Design a binder for this molecule. Structure first.
Ligand SMILES: Nc1ccn([C@@H]2O[C@H](COP(=O)(O)OP(=O)(O)OP(=O)(O)O)[C@@H](O)[C@H]2O)c(=O)n1
Ligand SMILES: Nc1ccn([C@@H]2O[C@H](COP(=O)(O)OP(=O)(O)OP(=O)(O)O)[C@@H](O)[C@H]2O)c(=O)n1
Ligand SMILES: NC(=O)CC[C@H](N)C(=O)O
Ligand SMILES: NC(=O)CC[C@H](N)C(=O)O
Ligand SMILES: NC(=O)CC[C@H](N)C(=O)O
Ligand SMILES: [Mg+2]
Ligand SMILES: [Mg+2]
Ligand SMILES: [Mg+2]
Lengths: 535, 532, 535
């Protein structure tokens, strides 16, 4: 079976929903039994998003194999059951960095190294490596048709299409169709002009996905076809919907996947969207409501927490509980006190870097342990909770993480090789990716995950200081999971509490709307339980 | 006194507000004491909008000199006091038409006649004609930058800018900066792309006017400036507003007029927007409310009645009355009956052509003459009033206009050449025309003068031979022309407020100066509303 | 005094003569007493041309400070008396390589690193560093307006222009105006369309330089002005000329520099072109003719030898001798024998890498030493001559350079740390840039350069093997110059010959048409002397 490529580009503006549109299309194809994958090409110069603040392009997502990648890969894994790896995300930086290393070491045998063919060859090679043995590969191109930064990407895929042939390649282009109040109509002009820009780069789109805040009527769809050399049936409307889970069914109901299977000549059964319809049904029919406070330092751009917010939403689905997520600046806790935590059925403290806003989290971890409000702490949020417990229950004054005050008396969280005592004695490298974790026989989480061993994903360097550990266990705190070797602590529980769990790994990256996640489902159940005993 | 041009263009999408934007800008400049004018270049092929359906590009506006032009000229006249004439509007059709004629007749001396320089030359000459003897001329280019249709307009102005010089020309380019809900941001990408299209046609914009449904924040303005080679102070924000009357003010508060005066080297006092401030204040503080029904055949596209809608709103201002205009399909008076006129404090029947829906208008004029509801009838509306009368009070069975049923026994409205009687016995107006007011009419009063000037666009007149008969049965002749004493205004004098006229009074109404008929009409509608 | 920038771009095609057009313009400005410089921006990905074969974009030029750069810098140094350094040439590779190194080490503080502003900032910074304290800086942009590879360059300079203002920036754009035989006219259409491409990138050219194979008449110049928003007087004609030395006077005679000085507001005296007129006069009035054979492995692209060919031409000027340069494949010597060297008044063997064609050079060095035909050997050509002498006069059979047969018995040329005996005994890193060299008291070259110490430029790694040196001196060969320390051999002479010199340094990079070069002038004199005793 020959591999087919659908290239996804966007025009007019960015924030158009390319990731989500691609992922949804992939979900449909998946449900026709096709073997599908997706990859993201980002135009940034960063070698990988590992050096990007979460308020730049949102969360740094992590795949099983430890790659730091764009958050689109989160969308991909939540719409299809394929696992993303390093192979599904690369940037312009990564391309240039490979080519420079090869040029400097003489691999090009004295040739002038050029954007074409050398940069573009490099791009084609990773596109082929990401597609390897899949029937259909959606290749999402970042940036907007017309700007400078994504031109080599577009020229690469142009070349591929000619090389591979139109029998096995399609171009899917998203554009904006804005509504004008004065005239009461949506406008095709930007689509017309975007398609001319795309053509001027040498690409004829085959399918047009029309983004608007309402459906694009037949009249205007026909106008777009007329001007873009695309048949009417390949001009698809994609309105703003109240739930992303509806997107696959919306695209299916307009023939998009039929049109694709015909072009690629695949006999495949009609997409069965039962799992989506189920998720949609669940979402539409909550039995009760909770309010969960997410308390962290990046709430000014919520995408910093994209996968967490979705995991919560999946926790809602598994409990038929509608989760109202209220974002709370953890630094306002420092200023305005515990006051602003009033009125919450649970509390989540997410991950982060840098001292700013961390003392507000420690406080937040406290308030939730003392008032018996259920608490989930992820990475940093597990670290600030160890810190809370030590300071306030094992009475280790001023305890902290070497990340924030390097020279503190009780460094409860520190790099493995910074580990020391309160006396100064010692014993005689980012953790990335999927790692096995042993669950402790009598813990909440051993029951929730219901297995002695689980696999979750890491992105952190600061560990639980084993040298100060016994002193904290002795004061009540329980260790609920450890790694495979060198027993580092992965999970802690405060057992005098309805529901208080915190973990080092990012469980949100393995949560999905179809299959949920045992930790979040638990966390949300507890929030509902707690909500109902206050009423 | 060198003449300065400001070329106004539009990018991304149309329906951007170029007309109003340009008109507002003009309003500010006039308020600084400058001699100013505006003109519209339409890319369409119609020689003029005279053959255009009112549901196509809206109403056909008529200027003092009797030209039929785009409705944008209405906006112009409602923002500045300079009078538009036929030189303030021309189409691509008009341009090719003149060049073709000159060519078939040999004026090109056997040259190959080309888009450049012959079509572009013809465009340049007309832009110069519309501009002559003005300080600042706003030239509004129809269509959207990027499209085929307006390229010759764009190349002609590019040439003009280079000929006349950068010290006397400015390019103002409007764009759309849409809001994305996903990100909570307005987006400058389309502006950056549109300025590129404009540059590729050889035009560097000087001023960017950013349309959006909310203000464009300083960050986005700064990014537009960085990418488009314009300084930040020349990136202006023009959000959707709740009242066009606030647009002169909104632009002036961002320094637009200063920027222009600086570039064109003019010392002019600061703009005095007091009349606009007054207009905004009136509109913001109505004391009563009314519902007025507009009954006619083009309600599917409200711009068909653009100047009438506005003249009512100006009637509102002058009485501090807020007017709700209920657009009513007069075809529905035919199907569903007089019920659909339930709940109106006044009824206006506007102009039109074609029989479809006119029987509904006659039922409508009756309803109002009968149930003592105030009525204003413009052109068709005045004609269908006479039909109602003769037909229901002078008992002239099935009376009509020859435009609709040519061989009717009683042609009360008919071309002047068609003028007959009930036995068969015997014996198109455009522009500003003098009208004489009858000494004892509700209208000699409202206009507070003997003779007036109003604008015509119609063929069919009141039949003078059937006239003395309808006068006897009650009806009153309130105004008449110069010669042939044709009937211009009729009143039913046993009604609180019933006026109807042949001319289009809406074309002279402005928000600053109001209009005596619509002031009158709206005042009456208020008085009626109080009595229920 | 404020720095002014003239940006030079090209359109329609490449090979348009941007380097030469810029350099000539610089020469005019120089002659108005202005302090001028020039820089080249290349769109290649190579970090620097050090890894490019000479048949890629021609010779790798070397500046005093040792930078490996584009051959345009040769043109610059031959038209103005400023010295080029690393500062005057950078590539896209160099830009990306700096930015990647800074991004990976966290210098961007978590920002997304983008083509704009990060790549473009980097470019602006080197443009400012190259311009530092000069009155006028010509900034030559490589590639052709309209292609992908030079877009960031164009966007950078666009930004600069707005920032610095039009008071101190001009855009000079070259285009092609082709002659059509069918119609008998030159065509302005490509200029029209190129200027629209340049505008679409956001740059309004200020000056148009019209390349054609004949002058561009007034009619068409006016047409170009009409369509490009440029005044007639800024549309300059630049026909194919028989001598580049005429280009400054051609541009001057059309007001180009007047137009520039007016725009930048400089009072400067009229350009005095006396030195050029002199060079032109010299060139036009040769007294006799010679034929010099250039024998090397890259003659398929003569630009591989750009500066050598020009040095010869300057040697012609200093002797009023018209040099007919005949290029000869040194590999055809291997095949067709010494035969193809018949009919030559001198012989030059240039530099190179790799064994292919080197045995033909050794042979060539031989033929010239035996028949007393004057010989100049540069770098490789000095190495193959040591090799010739050893094999055939010091009778060291099969002698060679470790570069070619690493394990040979007599490695006469080898890396310093490969140095060994014919017995295998030993004693108890490219050379780049301007280095001092001591001249030997009784040598030809000590007289020609007329000083005990000279400065010439290196680009080589293989040295004269000091361990086998005494054995070659003993057989006749004389050392004519050495370095400063560690006495490595820079120059050799065979003293039983009318004129036989060879050197390690590249003397062609310090030769110019105005001031000539003592070695080449000598070499050409000798060729003329030799030509005249055969007649
Ligand atoms: N490449 C094109 C496409 C359309 N037009 C012109 O576009 C005008 C219509 O303008 P507008 O409504 O702004 O364009 P639409 O195509 O209707 O797009 P939208 O849906 O945005 O209105 C027509 O007169 C037609 O001649 C043009 O000149 N060149
Ligand atoms: N001519 C341009 C302009 C911008 N960019 C790229 O555009 C990206 C920003 O994308 P986006 O936010 O979509 O564009 P903005 O310029 O911010 O515009 P908007 O207001 O629509 O976001 C940057 O990485 C920059 O490299 C580009 O490649 N070419
Ligand atoms: N993403 C996170 O929460 C990281 C936590 C902490 N700063 C660490 O590096 O270990
Ligand atoms: N504009 C109109 O109302 C036209 C009225 C009528 N059809 C006429 O021609 O006289
Ligand atoms: N440019 C050259 O001639 C180099 C000569 C020789 N291959 C060396 O590296 O020393
Ligand atoms: Mg339209
Ligand atoms: Mg942006
Ligand atoms: Mg021609």
């Amino acid at each position: 079976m020959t591999t087919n490529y659908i290239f996804v580009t966007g025009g007019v503006v960015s924030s158009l929903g390319k990731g989500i549109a691609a992922a949804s299309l992939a979900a449909i194809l998946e449900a026709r039994g096709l073997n599908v994958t997706i990859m993201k090409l980002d135009p940034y110069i960063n070698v990988d998003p590992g050096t990007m603040s979460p308020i730049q392009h949102g969360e740094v997502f992590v795949t099983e194999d430890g790659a730091e990648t764009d958050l689109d890969l989160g969308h991909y894994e939540r719409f299809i059951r394929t696992k993303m790896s390093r192979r599904n995300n690369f940037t312009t930086g990564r391309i240039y960095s490979d080519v420079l290393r090869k040029e400097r070491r003489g691999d090009y045998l004295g040739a002038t190294v050029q954007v074409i063919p050398h940069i573009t060859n490099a791009i084609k090679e990773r596109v082929l490596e990401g597609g390897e043995g899949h029937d259909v590969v959606l290749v999402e191109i970042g940036g907007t048709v017309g700007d400078i930064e994504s031109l080599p990407f577009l020229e690469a895929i142009r070349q591929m299409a000619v090389e591979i042939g139109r029998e096995h390649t399609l171009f899917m282009h998203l554009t904006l169709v804005p509504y004008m109040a004065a005239s009461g109509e949506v406008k095709t002009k930007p689509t017309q002009h975007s398609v001319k820009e795309l053509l001027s780069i040498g690409i004829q789109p085959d399918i047009l996905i029309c983004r608007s805040d309402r459906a694009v009527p037949a009249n205007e769809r026909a106008k777009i076809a007329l001007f873009c050399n695309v048949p009417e049936k390949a001009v698809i409307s994609l309105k703003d919907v109240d739930s992303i889970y509806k997107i696959p069914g919306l695209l299916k109901s307009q023939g998009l996947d039929d049109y694709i299977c015909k072009r690629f000549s695949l006999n495949a059964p009609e997409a069965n969207l039962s799992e989506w319809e189920q998720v949609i049904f669940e979402e539409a029919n909550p039995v009760s409501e909770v309010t969960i406070g997410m308390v962290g330092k990046y709430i000014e751009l919520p995408d910093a927490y994209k996968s967490v917010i979705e995991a919560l939403k999946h926790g809602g689905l598994k409990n038929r509980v509608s989760v109202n997520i209220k974002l709370i600046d953890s630094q306002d806790v420092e200023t305005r006190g515990v006051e602003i935590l009033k009125g919450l059925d649970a509390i989540l403290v997410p991950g982060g870097f840098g001292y700013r806003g961390v003392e507000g989290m420690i406080t937040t971890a406290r308030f939730a342990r003392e008032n018996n409000i259920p608490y989930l702490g992820i990475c940093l949020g597990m670290q600030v909770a160890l810190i809370d417990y030590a300071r306030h229950v094992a009475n280790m004054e001023n305890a902290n993480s070497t990340e924030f005050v390097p020279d503190c008396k009780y460094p409860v969280v520190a790099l493995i090789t910074e580990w020391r005592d309160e006396n100064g004695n010692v014993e005689v490298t980012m953790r990335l990716g999927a790692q096995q974790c042993q669950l402790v026989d009598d813990s909440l989480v051993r029951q929730l995950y219901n297995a002695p061993t689980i696999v979750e994903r890491h992105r952190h360097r600061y560990e639980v200081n084993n040298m100060l550990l016994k002193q904290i266990e002795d004061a009540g705190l329980r260790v609920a999971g450890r790694s495979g070797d060198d027993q580092l602590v992965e999970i802690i529980e405060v057992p005098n509490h309805p529901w208080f769990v915190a973990c080092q790994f990012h469980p949100e990256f393995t949560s999905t709307p179809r299959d949920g996640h045992p930790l979040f489902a638990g966390f949300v159940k507890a929030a509902s339980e707690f909500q109902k005993r206050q009423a």
